[model samples]
Target: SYDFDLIIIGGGSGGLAAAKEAAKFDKKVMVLDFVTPTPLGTNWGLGGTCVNVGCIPKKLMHQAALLGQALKDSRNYGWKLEDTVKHDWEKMTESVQNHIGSLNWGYRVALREKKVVYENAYGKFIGPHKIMATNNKGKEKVYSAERFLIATGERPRYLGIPGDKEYCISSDDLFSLPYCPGKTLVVGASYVALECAGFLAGIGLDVTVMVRSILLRGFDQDMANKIGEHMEEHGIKFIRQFVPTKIEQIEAGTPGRLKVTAKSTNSEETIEDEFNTVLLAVGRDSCTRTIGLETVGVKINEKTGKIPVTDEEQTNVPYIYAIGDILEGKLELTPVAIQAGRLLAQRLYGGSTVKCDYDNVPTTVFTPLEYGCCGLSEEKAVEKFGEENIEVYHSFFWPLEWTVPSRDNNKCYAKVICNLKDNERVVGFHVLGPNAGEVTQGFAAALKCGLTKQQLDSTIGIHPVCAEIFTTLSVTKRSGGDILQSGCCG
Candidate 1:
């Protein structure tokens, strides 16, 4: 009856995942995707931001920075090395880009094998059940489907200051930048800004971060401050309560100098500085504006460019659904989007009742020192359950690896929040240290299984590991007890 069972707009993780899942039910599905080039003419293949510009390239560069640190620590570990260790920016970008290219191709091949139609075209809704896809050549084709999923994702927002688009580079341009950033000024306090600044500083670049307000807003503030403090201690400069007013090109080269004028948020005073690069990581806005949601009466938050969907990922129109970053208030995570899409497909066609649970999802900020957490933040937990109904157990730990290097002792930290009304059920988990993602992932599963403070206390810990700090967490924040740990055995 319909041209296809489903037509998904956007070839990002969520849309692609949903397309493939629908194909498993023998439903004909088509995916329409296109990437509009950045203002600097930077464009990438499929796999959306995560594969082409986000998590994949980010973690790789973060690892490159980590290796630089390891070389320094190697000396203390008795490995004789050269006095000067240099980094090859071009080579690193080449490797990261190559891997990303392969991933993009893999997604294309997957769609083909799944018998899902893939179109490299931008899609816009012309009717409630119809879409018009326009290709690069200005050719348009209309298609109708029984269901539609919008997962167009988001793109970085830029400061509207003078010369910003002409002079400033965003995270979209940073990963694929052909030259080293040299002495860079990163503007914003988001995790993107911190992560990029952390790695750049780690790689021996002079980096400065300008913060409009607090760092890592909407995350656990205690952990967020710790990350900023660690980066500051590691030579990444922070200019708090300042925002750039304009950017001007002082000179132009592969890595050129630029003049930045900024003003203090609290005062009328303004300051000017020059840097080799000005990278903007302020935030991202969803890609919903151009999709013609208004034409079809799909309600969206005008301020956020995000769509409000029902619990089943459905729009007000029964045949329209939304997922991924474009969804209102959903976690902007690749895995979360993928899971939701797959479950959405199953529920629609495979007669499954399983719903995607967005609660207690684990995530990590891949800064120089990673911060991982799951469930409600301490602030959120206090607000939801009241400080009187919650118990916070925390500790400051010294990682064993730091001992040999004689670095960052008592800097690594861990905490767990338990609800008194829920029989001390662990409701929040947080860790700031190496391998924070790996450490928090296992505990995230525990929390999902209704992990309790008593269960954590009874569980045996892996000796000589940072994760053990959670098991040994006894000093409550309310009690103001000492939480510093000493030897490996402790």
Candidate 2:
């Protein structure tokens, strides 16, 4: 008999969720996971990237920046302060790390409560239906299972240049960086780049973003451009059409100075600059390479190292499955992973036939002005449904809370993409504003139920709120209507 009914290779959100679900049926489940330290030796316990270095820490840092903005706006609201409000980077990291440590321990306690075997070891397939787990202390053990799950997640990619790993820090290290990253240079156009640069600027740091092409490459272009414009006006610099060629150490210290050299993507032009810190958010690579997938004949995309799976998340080898960021062509999000993992386990042990739906997934990027959306982007919608088959209703709105602060230049945006061929059904919902995630979540549910423009028109407005702008939308992009912003019930 197999030593375990199910064994998951990662303790990330997906693996943990599936492990607990399988255990509910009184099945023997083992979760083997380990975090390999970053080039800067950044590491954490229990929960995967989201808990340690990703969503949780990132959002908390974003909120810290938002709090600084609130203080400035408070002055406009007649709330006076005696002196400057400087953010304490050390204090922020200390508390966040403390909170993360508590969650890490909680995960262990929960697994114990559920009787799921948990091991802080790196699990890799070595033979048919078998895995070799090696702990941090170098102890190796083998376990056999009827079925297996791979959810090892991803790691930050480096520039592959000299001094890149020795000097440059990525999102992996930024969250836990011991000191304040003074005048920082963010080198990528990804969401990670923008979010980090946004908060850095918000907290009064001189921040510059170097981009080889465009911002938020896979997202809606219109929204991405608007975000870039807002950031420019709010004092963040953009270095477009260039890439770093070299990074050299200038001085050694916590938040030490460094020299960077870059060449234009389109030309031979080169530039040099110095900054206290450089954050490389270029990209992330799947953690599939080292887990010995080839030994078990699990097919993975050669280029991206992402495993392609059936709709039900099964690898080519029926005995093995893949989920989370490592899944090819699937959304690499924490919640998506959790849903897929739980559903997969339920179908295996709880007699459920439901599969995880990859469509109409809502997510938020916590830039200074948050951006949230669900379903397809406008460009994708036009491509899939044809330009003539879709309509875009859009507007800009100023929140009532911001009205008192009188940020005349600051405006939030909203848009709904409707499919003309399907009773004007809302195919895409997007919002760029304060707490865009909160606004998008409720609307995402409606989109899931096949929301229509007619229904949106029938809905009543909630006065003096940003989301009300959606209910009161009357203009269309096709009509070329005057799409000016609304303010305080205007």
Candidate 3:
């Protein structure tokens, strides 16, 4: 018999949660993690990527940058400034590190207090029920369990463009740089790229983002445009409809800089520029490279390069389960992963059969204005439900604080989508404004419960709060368009 009932690989957000909950259920569980000094380092461990390099650090940086902008714009609010507000990136970076460091140690302490065994190593599957854990000193430990959960997260994927090797830097490295880049060129139009571009630009960096198509392609087109407009207004340059065709490294024209040549995909013309650094925010790959997935019969999609699994988070081999980036579909957000961990632990130990429902998963971008969306987007509603059946209600207004004399930059907006043919059932909610993250949570819950427009409208509004927009707006009066077809569920 194995020492534990369950063994979890990749002691990240999902794995840690599982370990804690399973231990609570009196199940013997083991969690394996690594200790490194980079963004992925264990010094910032505990909550995994979300707590370390991915979400927490990024959001904190974004907020710091936002505060700097607010200080600059505070004058518009009739606030007299005596001393200039300057951001010390180094100080903020150190503070973030200290916070994460303390949290990492706290996680270890929690696991110890809970009496869960914690192993420090990179774990790989050695058999259907065994994992080989390797430490930095070439030491190996064998762990066997009746079941295993693979919560290995993702890392940045390189484009393999010429000169990308020496000059290219991944998002993981971007977070721990000794100093912020003076001129940063971000590649990829994904949400990561946009967030990076916005944060860097907000901090007074000369930032340029090159994307193959319209920004945030998978999101609502209008919402994506809003993101682009916001970025452009903040002095971030966008090269739209252009993809990188080539990369050439030229000798350092100036000290500590390299000139790069890139060809445009649209015009087939070459462009050259000198940037202090290039951030490859392209995408991430599953951490299954060396973790012995091949031996466990876990099927990976050739197209998405994602591990194949069922709704129950079970792999081809029932003994092995997967979640987080290793699984397919959106909602790779931190909360989703942690929720999956909770559900999986309940199913494994507490005998609950709950499964993770991924539909309408709420997500927030830590950009200066903060943005959140749940459910179908305006364009997506039209695409999924027929145009005649869909209806959109949107509002754009200045925050009341703006009445205090703020720039147009502080504008806030909200949008809701519904099915006009079915009592205008609410299907989507999106918001771009300050505190957007806080506003969308309740809406996301309503969406999960399949709330209708009438219910949303009839709900009492908390006067003067921005979220009241959802409850106060009359769909019949504010309807702007209709849906064309019902889109895919979840």
The alpha-carbon lDDT assigned to residue 72 of candidate 2 equals 80
Give the per-residue lDDT digits (tens) of candidate 1, residues 279-344: 987889999998878778898898999889888999888889999998998899999999999999
Q: Note the Cα lDDT for every prediction shown.
A: 0.91, 0.90, 0.77
Give the winner by lDDT: 1
Model 1 / residue 294 / CA error / Å: 2.6
Clashing pairs in 1: none
Question: Which digits, one per residue and each the tens of the lDDT, describe model 3 over residues 1-490?
Answer: 8867898887788888888888988878889887444332324455678777788778878887877867877787678985676666678788887887887888899999988888888888877788899986879988889999989888777776766755667667666666656687888987889898888888878899988767786787787787778778879997766656555555443223656555565456546476777777798877776688787777777676677788888888988888787787746677888889889988888899899888888887766567889888887887889888887777664566555544663356678889988788888888988788899998889887878988887899876787876775543424443322122222
Error of 2 at 351 (Å): 0.8
lDDT of model 2, residue 119: 91
Better of 2 and 3 by lDDT: 2
TM-score of each: 0.98, 0.98, 0.91
Q: How would you encode candidate 2's per-residue C-alpha lDDT over 380-432 as one tens digit per residue?
A: 99999999999999988878888777884346899999999999899998899
lDDT order of candidates, best first?
1, 2, 3
Clashing pairs in 2: none
